Write a protein that binds this ligand. Structure first.
Ligand code: AKG
Ligand code: MN
Length: 204
DNA sequence: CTGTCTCACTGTCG
DNA sequence: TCGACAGTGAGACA
């Protein structure tokens, strides 16, 4: 397996196709069968005083005994299922990084998306990386420097763009999530679903 | 109280 | 139709 080292000012990420086509195909099928996504309040978000559905399905899974913050609430992730443990194990076996939690985001097509954000690190093990594993449709992913955002950016730091392919792993290492925002922009020409798993190491 | 940060839509311009 | 870009606030903090 070949790794791409993604580097810029305050950006340190690595990218590889971690699962080959056949394995990634099987995993995608099993995720589509088995993952249980949020419904009701957890699938709603208020933005600028207006309520909308979250523009992607979400779920969490993790180790027994864990809790996390999401919406309004302190919540417990669902118990691991084997397909998720298969993925986690291969990530940990290759990288030596260990994870106790995963956020799953399912993008039905190019109209599902996630706006520019930094992962909330408050309840994460200090300095821990986040492993982003993708199955299904390739989707464009964008890194934008925190001081290069908006109408009149303080700095004109180059955006870093890359497609996240079927079976790929993007490792995002400290201090990427301090200095850079990332997003999965709307791509209306993408008609097929994508399931993304972001593994994290949360505080007990 | 006191700031700062966040989430995603809709409308306009091309 | 697509998309780039700007503009929109209430809630959770430190
Ligand atoms: O779907 C992706 O690849 C990004 C998801 C993400 O950044 C997140 O949920 O924090
Ligand atoms: Mn993220």
């Amino acid at each position: 397996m070949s790794w791409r080292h993604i580097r810029a000012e305050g950006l340190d990420s690595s990218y590889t196709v971690l699962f080959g086509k056949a394995e990634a195909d099987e995993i995608f099928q099993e995720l589509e069968k088995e993952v249980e996504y949020f419904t009701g309040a957890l699938a709603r978000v208020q933005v600028f005083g207006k309520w909308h559905s979250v523009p992607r399905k979400q779920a969490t899974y993790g180790d027994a005994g864990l809790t996390y913050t999401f919406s309004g609430l302190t919540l417990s992730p669902k118990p691991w299922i084997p397909v998720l443990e298969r993925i986690r194990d291969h990530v940990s076996g290759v990288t030596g990084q260990t994870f106790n939690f995963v956020l799953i985001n399912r993008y039905k097509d190019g109209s599902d998306h996630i706006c520019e954000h930094r992962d909330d690190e408050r309840e994460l093990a200090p300095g821990s990386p986040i492993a982003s594993v993708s199955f299904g449709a390739s989707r464009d992913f964008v890194f934008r420097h925190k001081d290069s955002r908006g109408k009149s950016p303080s700095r004109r730091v180059a955006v870093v763009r890359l497609p996240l392919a079927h079976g790929s792993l993007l490792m995002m290492n400290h201090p990427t999530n301090t200095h850079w925002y990332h997003s999965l922009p709307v791509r209306k020409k993408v008609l097929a679903p994508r399931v993304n798993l972001t593994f994290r190491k949360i505080l007990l």
